[PDB]
Symmetry: C4
Subunit: 101 residues, 4 copies
């Protein structure tokens, strides 16, 4: 009765504007409903984090990953790009769903 | 009189379901029998490990790598994906055959 | 009223001549003027740096990235390759524009 | 009056046979004679090393990189794969020519 989250580490990068800087870590994410009922994602969000429990904000995400619900057997996929001001986001090793959004 | 194991580090990733999380390290593996006799793999398994001797469970493996035997000169290849709950598996640097399966 | 700098970490490398050695980190860089006025880059330069503020010299850069100005909505892109004598440049995680050139 | 050595870090890997294991780091190497005279490479060899000066044996190399000489303007390229028993070779960041072969 929970959505399955598959992530693969992608490109590392940065964004700078004047003296405002941040680092980025991209993941290719696939969400899969392997249960027998429709699961709502409306009050859920994607969080990337280190094994120590440090989490990182989502900077940009492909529209497909923001589906409100996932019917049984349905799958959505796309890129999700997380950020930190420093280089901490490079240690993000897990993408998961939170309901604290 | 042992099978040769060639591995190349591939993608780093993760799998999450509810609050059950793990990290993944993929390798492309090739097994080669460079001896003069057939070698049995029936009671052998692929293990990934760090240089310090810490080993990691095999989460998924391509069917081709689970051949029961390898005749002389035979070669099989495919992906093998190992896991840890935390990010330890990212230090797996060796794939080898164990007979403790 | 500042140019936006998008960078993605690319190849790691080295250059050696006799006993003169250095390490290289490439980035794909895109510069974007998202403001309403033309912005001059004539006295600006690309700097790569670590989160701790350690910066690295630019060894080579694609001609497209050395435009003197960027009109509104204009974008230029190319590779930029930064260097260190030791392996410090591998921790460069940000490309930004400096006006101290 | 020295050959120029350009290297780019490639795949990380391993080789195992029975309980004999090693780790591998591949580089794409290009050798370039940018001088005005023919330079002999007959008593030279490719060495990979860390910034601290730790060096690693050459396990395999493409035939093209073992040219005996390089005439003016000549260039040769190919892959070179270096090894360590443990995972030290993963810190090799420089390929250079030695005359101690």
């Amino acid at each position: 009765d929970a959505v399955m989250v598959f992530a693969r580490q992608g490109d590392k990068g940065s964004v700078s504007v004047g003296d405002k800087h941040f680092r980025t870590q991209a993941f290719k994410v696939r969400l899969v409903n392997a249960a027998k009922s429709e699961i709502s994602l409306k009050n859920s969000c994607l969080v990337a984090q280190s094994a120590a429990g440090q989490s990182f904000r989502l900077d940009t995400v492909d529209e497909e990953l923001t589906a409100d619900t996932l019917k049984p057997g349905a799958s959505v996929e796309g890129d999700a790009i997380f950020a930190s001001e420093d280089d901490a986001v490079y240690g993000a090793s897990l993408v998961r769903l939170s309901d604290r959004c």
